[PDB]
Scaffold this motif. Sequence first.
Motif, short mmCIF file in Angstrom:
data_model
loop_
_atom_site.label_atom_id
_atom_site.label_comp_id
_atom_site.label_asym_id
_atom_site.label_seq_id
_atom_site.Cartn_x
_atom_site.Cartn_y
_atom_site.Cartn_z
N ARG A 1 -4.97 5.39 6.87
CA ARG A 1 -6.38 4.96 6.76
C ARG A 1 -6.53 3.70 5.91
O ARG A 1 -7.23 2.77 6.28
CB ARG A 1 -7.24 6.08 6.14
CG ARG A 1 -8.74 5.72 5.94
CD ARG A 1 -9.60 6.92 5.48
NE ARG A 1 -9.42 8.12 6.32
CZ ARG A 1 -8.57 9.14 6.11
NH1 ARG A 1 -7.80 9.24 5.01
NH2 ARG A 1 -8.51 10.12 7.00
N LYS A 2 -5.84 3.69 4.77
CA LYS A 2 -5.93 2.60 3.84
C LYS A 2 -5.34 1.33 4.51
O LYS A 2 -5.97 0.28 4.46
CB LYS A 2 -5.25 2.96 2.51
CG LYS A 2 -5.22 1.86 1.44
CD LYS A 2 -5.01 2.46 0.05
CE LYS A 2 -4.93 1.39 -1.05
NZ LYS A 2 -6.28 0.96 -1.47
N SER B 1 1.40 4.43 -3.12
CA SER B 1 0.50 5.55 -2.87
C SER B 1 1.00 6.79 -3.57
O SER B 1 2.16 6.88 -4.00
CB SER B 1 0.38 5.83 -1.40
OG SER B 1 -0.07 4.68 -0.73
N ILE C 1 0.82 -1.22 0.00
CA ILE C 1 0.00 0.00 0.00
C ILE C 1 0.86 1.27 0.00
O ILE C 1 0.63 2.20 -0.79
CB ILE C 1 -0.97 -0.02 1.22
CG1 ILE C 1 -2.08 -1.05 0.98
CG2 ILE C 1 -1.58 1.32 1.49
CD1 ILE C 1 -2.78 -1.50 2.25
N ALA D 1 -3.75 9.36 4.36
CA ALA D 1 -4.43 8.46 3.42
C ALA D 1 -3.82 7.06 3.53
O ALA D 1 -4.55 6.07 3.64
CB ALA D 1 -4.34 8.98 2.01
N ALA E 1 -7.88 0.18 7.07
CA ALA E 1 -9.11 -0.38 6.50
C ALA E 1 -8.84 -1.79 5.90
O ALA E 1 -9.74 -2.62 5.91
CB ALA E 1 -9.70 0.56 5.43
N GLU E 2 -7.62 -2.06 5.41
CA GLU E 2 -7.42 -3.24 4.55
C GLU E 2 -6.62 -4.38 5.15
O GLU E 2 -6.72 -5.51 4.70
CB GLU E 2 -6.79 -2.81 3.21
CG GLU E 2 -7.76 -1.98 2.36
CD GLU E 2 -7.13 -1.43 1.07
OE1 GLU E 2 -6.06 -1.93 0.66
OE2 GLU E 2 -7.76 -0.54 0.44
#
Lengths: 86, 86
Positions: free
Chosen positions: A65-66, A21, A17, A62, A69-70
């Motif tokens: 958060r990503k 990004s 991730i 960002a 969330a994942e």
Amino acid sequence: VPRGSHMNDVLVDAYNIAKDSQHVHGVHYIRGRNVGEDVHLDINIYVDADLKVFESDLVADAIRRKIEAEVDHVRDVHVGVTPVRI
Amino acid sequence: PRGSHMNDVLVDAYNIAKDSQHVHGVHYIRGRNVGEDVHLDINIYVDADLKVFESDLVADAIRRKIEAEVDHVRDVHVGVTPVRIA
């Protein structure tokens, strides 16, 4: 003693991730610490030294958060920035 | 600085550490991209009542095995955290 069985997936998924990004020149470092069954994560990304702080701040957030969330088994995620001239 | 080897470095090193003889578990693992290299700091939980010469051999066998088997790694450091289940 922390179980550790999720470290490999956590580090791999978080790195993947971060690395792709927006505004990231590359990953500088990544650290994982086993705590209980979960992992505490510190990731540090290289960004353009001339980015405004409010911009680097959005980028880091960002990514955080990503990852939250994942990626399973992550308890706490800090995303730090290292400036580099380009 | 590309970072394309971090994932294999962390996974392989973690696995070697975690399945070595006297390790109760991995405490933490840190990887840093340097040029094309990954610098690695790994910290293992061992029995608090292990003799220091024993924990020293354990850390060193893990360091050697990581150096021998895991590509793109430089300056592997293996640290120890005692735990007394007693």
